[PDB]
Design an enzyme around this catalytic site. Structure first.
Site, short mmCIF file in Angstrom:
data_model
loop_
_atom_site.label_atom_id
_atom_site.label_comp_id
_atom_site.label_asym_id
_atom_site.label_seq_id
_atom_site.Cartn_x
_atom_site.Cartn_y
_atom_site.Cartn_z
N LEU A 15 -8.08 -10.92 -4.99
CA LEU A 15 -7.17 -10.39 -3.95
C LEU A 15 -7.78 -10.28 -2.54
O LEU A 15 -7.03 -10.20 -1.57
CB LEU A 15 -6.62 -9.02 -4.37
CG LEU A 15 -5.55 -8.98 -5.46
CD1 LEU A 15 -5.19 -7.53 -5.76
CD2 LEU A 15 -4.31 -9.76 -5.07
N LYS A 42 -11.64 -1.98 -6.81
CA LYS A 42 -12.68 -2.19 -5.77
C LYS A 42 -14.11 -1.94 -6.29
O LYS A 42 -14.34 -1.01 -7.07
CB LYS A 42 -12.43 -1.28 -4.55
CG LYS A 42 -13.60 -1.20 -3.56
CD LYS A 42 -13.27 -0.43 -2.28
CE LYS A 42 -14.50 -0.33 -1.39
NZ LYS A 42 -14.26 0.36 -0.09
N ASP A 136 -8.24 3.30 11.18
CA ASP A 136 -8.05 1.83 11.02
C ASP A 136 -6.57 1.37 10.90
O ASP A 136 -6.26 0.49 10.09
CB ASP A 136 -8.86 1.35 9.80
CG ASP A 136 -9.36 -0.09 9.93
OD1 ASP A 136 -9.06 -0.77 10.93
OD2 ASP A 136 -10.06 -0.54 9.00
#
Ligand SMILES: CCc1cc(O)ccc1-c1ccc2c(C(N)=O)n[nH]c2c1
EC number: 2.7.10.2
Length: 292
Positions: A15, A42, A136
Site C-alpha cells: 500500500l 505499519k 501534517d
C-alpha cells in the site's frame, strides 16, 4: 481487549513506503480457512531508538480517539520483541482523497466539494478539545469511506500542548513539507492551533484546483521564486517571498466567498486567524445558499 500474533497475519499486497517505514494489506486468519477480516499494518525499516520512541507515542494518541470523521484503531503485535513492533488499523478500500478525486472527478461538483470540507472541519474541532496539534494536514493524508463520507488520517507528527502554554516548540526538525507550512513554523519551529488553520487554507486550494499536478503548491511557488538566484537556499527564498505578501492565486471559477476564506487563513499575524468553530458555520451557510 485483544493482542495480535505474527503467525496468523497473511500478506496480500503493498500500500505504500517511505524512508523509515511502510504500509501493507493483510488478512488476520486464526481459523486458517481464509474467512478472516482484512486490515492495514505499519512497521519500521530503520529502527533508531529515537524513531522507535516516536512510534510508541503515535500509538497512545490513536488509542484515545473516537469520532465518525477520524480513522479507527484496532491493536498491536509484540511477537518478535520491541524492536520489531507492528500497528494494526481499519482497511478502507477507496484509499486517499488525492487518489480518489483524480479518478472519479467527472461525477464531483462544487456542492460535493463543500460536503467534504465540512466534515474535515468537524474532525479538527474535536482534536482541539483534547489539546492535540496534527502538524501534517493535506489531501494525501485524508481517507475515503464512501461517496458521502471522509476521515482524517496519518497521525505520525502529532503533538500534545503543555498545560501552561498555547504553543509547542519542536527539538530538531525532520524532513518537512515546507510548501504547506506557516511562516513562524519555518523560522522558529513553533506549532499551534493557528498553524493548523494556515494549513487548512492550502487544503481548500487543493480541492478547487481538482488536484491538478501543474497547479499544485510546489509548482506555483517555484514559478514565483523565478529563474535567477543563485546564492541562497530554496527555503530562504520562500521565507522572503512570504514576508513581502506573496500568495497563491485564485483558482479559475472559484466563488467570491470561498476565496475570501483562503485569504483570511493566510494572515502573517497569528492572533488574527479565524477559529474552526466559525469556519464550520460559514461553510454550511454557503452550501445552503447554493441549494435552492
Ligand atoms: C497503518 C498506517 C496508518 C497510520 C495512521 O496513524 C493513520 C492511518 C494509517 C492508514 C494508512 C493507510 C490506510 C489505508 C489504505 N487503503 O491505504 N486504509 N487504512 C489505512 C490506515
Amino acid at each position: 481487549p485483544t493482542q495480535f500474533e505474527e503467525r496468523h497475519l497473511k500478506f496480500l499486497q503493498q500500500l505504500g513506503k517511505g524512508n523509515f517505514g511502510s504500509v501493507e494489506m493483510c488478512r488476520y486468519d486464526p481459523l486458517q480457512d481464509n474467512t478472516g477480516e482484512v486490515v492495514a499494518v505499519k512497521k519500521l525499516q530503520h529502527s533508531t531508538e529515537e524513531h522507535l520512541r516516536d512510534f510508541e507515542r503515535e500509538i497512545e494518541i490513536l488509542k484515545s480517539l473516537q469520532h465518525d470523521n477520524i480513522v479507527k484503531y484496532k491493536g498491536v503485535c509484540y511477537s518478535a520483541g520491541r524492536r520489531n513492533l507492528k500497528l494494526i488499523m481499519e482497511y478502507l478500500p477507496y484509499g486517499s482523497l488525492r487518489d480518489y478525486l483524480q479518478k472519479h472527478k467527472e461525477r464531483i461538483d462544487h456542492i460535493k466539494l463543500l460536503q467534504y470540507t465540512s466534515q474535515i472541519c468537524k474532525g479538527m474541532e474535536y482534536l482541539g478539545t483534547k489539546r492535540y496539534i496534527h502538524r501534517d494536514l493535506a489531501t494525501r493524508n485524508i481517507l475515503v469511506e464512501n461517496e458521502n463520507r471522509v476521515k482524517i488520517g496519518d497521525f505520525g507528527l502529532t503533538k500534545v500542548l503543555p498545560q501552561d502554554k498555547e504553543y509547542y516548540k519542536v527539538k530538531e526538525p525532520g524532513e518537512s513539507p515546507i510548501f504547506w507550512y506557516a511562516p513562524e513554523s519555518l523560522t522558529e519551529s513553533k506549532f499551534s492551533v493557528a498553524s493548523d488553520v494556515w494549513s487548512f487554507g492550502v487544503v481548500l486550494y487543493e480541492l478547487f484546483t481538482y488536484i491538478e499536478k501543474s497547479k499544485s503548491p510546489p509548482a506555483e511557488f517555484m514559478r514565483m521564486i523565478g529563474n535567477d538566484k543563485q546564492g541562497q537556499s530554496i527555503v530562504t527564498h520562500l521565507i522572503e517571498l512570504l514576508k513581502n505578501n506573496g500568495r497563491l492565486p485564485r483558482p479559475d471559477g472559484c466563488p467570491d466567498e470561498i476565496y475570501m476564506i483562503m485569504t483570511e487563513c493566510w494572515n502573517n499575524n497569528v492572533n488574527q486567524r479565524p477559529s474552526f468553530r466559525d469556519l464550520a458555520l460559514r461553510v454550511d451557510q454557503i452550501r445552503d445558499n447554493m441549494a435552492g
